[PDB]
Amino acid sequence: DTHILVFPFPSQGHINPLLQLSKRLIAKGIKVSLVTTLHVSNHLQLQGAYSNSVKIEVISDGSEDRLETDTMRQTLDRFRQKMTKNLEDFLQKAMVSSNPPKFILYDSTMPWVLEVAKEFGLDRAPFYTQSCALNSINYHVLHGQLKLPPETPTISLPSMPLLRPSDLPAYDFDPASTDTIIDLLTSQYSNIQDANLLFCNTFDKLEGEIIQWMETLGRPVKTVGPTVPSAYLDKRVENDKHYGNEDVCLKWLDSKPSGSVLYVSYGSLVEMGEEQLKELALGIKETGKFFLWVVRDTEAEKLPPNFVESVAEKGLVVSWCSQLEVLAHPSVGCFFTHCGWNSTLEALCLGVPVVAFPQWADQVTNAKFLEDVWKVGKRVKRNEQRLASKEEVRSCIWEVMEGERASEFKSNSMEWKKWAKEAVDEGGSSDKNIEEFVAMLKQT
């Protein structure tokens, strides 16, 4: 029996892509052991009931956990030192056992895993869970052709679309952490010469030339995305309808005409100012369109006093909906999104045009691609003070849903939905790369 280790960065948020991929290759006959922390274990559903259910391997005791007193660097140092030792102790046992793992697939944000696998002679590959475009940016910042402060007004990287400085990832939200975050992202490409493969959460038709550029770094690149549940695409893997509730959103959507509703989500981790949140709320109201806005309790409290009351007819403002179920609903014609890589891929897979309102990090670069490269929507015009007016919000929504290019966006959205599904369906670019990896694993 062939089994591998999957070791994603242990944070609630980014372990889903690796789990989604795990489902693909559990279906192709590969057993998977999830390597994770005590903490993740407690907040994760306990081990499945089947023979080929993902096996949970807790290798830490909790002392790696970040402290309230820590700087990000200090948190990262303690995490690396302790988890290095933990992995070493784990493989010391696992490698000399009757069925030793054949591979370790680890999040690219933990490059020190490769050095541990190298010691044990264990086949290994990083997994880049963000866009291939970000791989190009972070690589070029590592090698010095791009600086943390852009040195020019237009950035023209090989095989990339032209980028303004405003299109580049902005990690200066916490200036204290900015240096540490840039170091972490650039260190993802330092030791790739010893990686068996480089896995990427994307597909060939979405970033084909960028992927071809990455292949010139000397290693086999395997595009295996998008990691959205099969049920919303090729529908070939049993269940796989969610990542890793009683819904009202679906009934409310059922009464609305096809393609008429704006789904609003500016991210489940993004905080927003009362000022900007007021302009956004009023801007959505001014369009006069049916809208479903999912915003969490702490964010929902910062809305204008009578806002929810005032949109009793057109607006459904709720604490939570199944984003995948809402996007797949035929009444939803447009998605106001913060352009997180997961939201971005979900919009493309479900063939829904976007009103892009990026906030931080890779969202800025994802927005650029959605508007100028994939052409499935528009970015809300910002101010000189980075504040979007309710008029800028209203016009952007109208232009995407009712403007000159409205039909272009939906047509392009349906094309990407087709191509995303084709990539993960039998014989697709992603399915082929996954079959190759599986075949390689059965060769030992």
Give the SS3 label for residue 163. strand
192, 334, 361, 423: which one binds ligand UPG (CB under 6 A): 361
Q: Least distance (Å) from ligand UPG to the CB of residue 319?
A: 8
**Residue 301 CB, nearest approach to ligand UPG (Å):** 17
Tokens of 330: 């035929």
| Distance (Å, whole) CA 389 – CA 276 | 8
Q: Is 14 annotated as a binding residue?
A: yes
Site for ligand UPG in 72-101 (CB under 6 A): none
Alpha-carbon distances, residue 177 vs 70, 181, 364 (angstroms): 11, 6, 19
Pick from 5, 367, 48, 401: which is nearest to 238 by CA? 48
Instruction: Look at residues 8, 5, 11 and name the one whose alpha carbon lies nearest to residue 91.
Output: 5
Q: Is 323 among the annotated ligand-binding positions? A: yes
Does 374 bind ligand UPG (CB under 6 A)? Our answer is no
Q: Which stretch binds ligand UPG (CB under 6 A): 61-69, 139-147, 282-290, 357-365?
A: 357-365
Q: Is 201 in the site for ligand UPG (CB under 6 A)?
A: no
Q: Which of 180, 323, 412, 413 binds ligand UPG (CB under 6 A)?
A: 323
The answer to whether 342 contacts ligand UPG (rule: CB under 6 A) is yes
Is residue 294 part of the contact set for ligand UPG (CB under 6 A)? yes
Work out the end-to-end distance of the chain between its first and last CA atoms, rounded to an integer number of angstroms: 11
Closest residue to bound ligand UPG by CB = 340
Choose, by CB under 6 A, the member of 343, 413, 430, 433 that binds ligand UPG.
Answer: 343
Q: Is 52 annotated as a binding residue?
A: no
Point out which span in 36-44, 144-152, 267-275, 378-386 binds ligand UPG (CB under 6 A).
Answer: 267-275
Nearer to ligand UPG among residue 79 and residue 341 (C-beta):
341
Q: Which residues contact 90 (CB under 8 A, 6 or more apart)?
A: 35, 57, 59
- The verdict on 324 binding ligand UPG (CB under 6 A) reads yes
Active site residue 14: yes
* Residue 247 touching ligand UPG (CB under 6 A): no
Residue count, binding to ligand UPG (CB under 6 A): 21
Q: Which two tokens stand for residue 111?
A: 């490059």
**CA–CA dist 2, 375 (Å, integer):** 42
C-alpha dist (Å) from residue 145 to 141, 152, 157, 181, 220: 6, 11, 8, 18, 23
Q: Which of 166, 191, 260, 268 binds ligand UPG (CB under 6 A)?
A: 268
Left, alpha or beta for 210 (phi > 0: left; psi -120 to 50: alpha)?
alpha
- Is residue 194 annotated as part of the catalytic site, yes or no? no
Residue 34 C-beta: closest distance to ligand UPG, Å: 18
Q: Coil, strand, or helix at residue 272?
A: coil
Question: Among 265, 276, 331, 429, which residue interacts with ligand UPG (rule: CB under 6 A)?
Answer: 265
In what order do the strands lie in the sheet containing 261-265? 315-318, 291-294, 261-265, 332-337, 354-356, 377-379
Backbone phi and psi for residue 349, each to the nearest 5 degrees, phi listed first: -60, -40
Residues in binding site: 14, 140, 268, 321, 323, 341-343, 346, 361-363
Catalytic residues: 14, 107
Residues in binding site for an anthocyanidin: 14, 140, 361
Contact residues: ligand UPG, CB under 6 A: 130, 243, 265, 267-270, 294, 320-324, 340-343, 346, 361-363
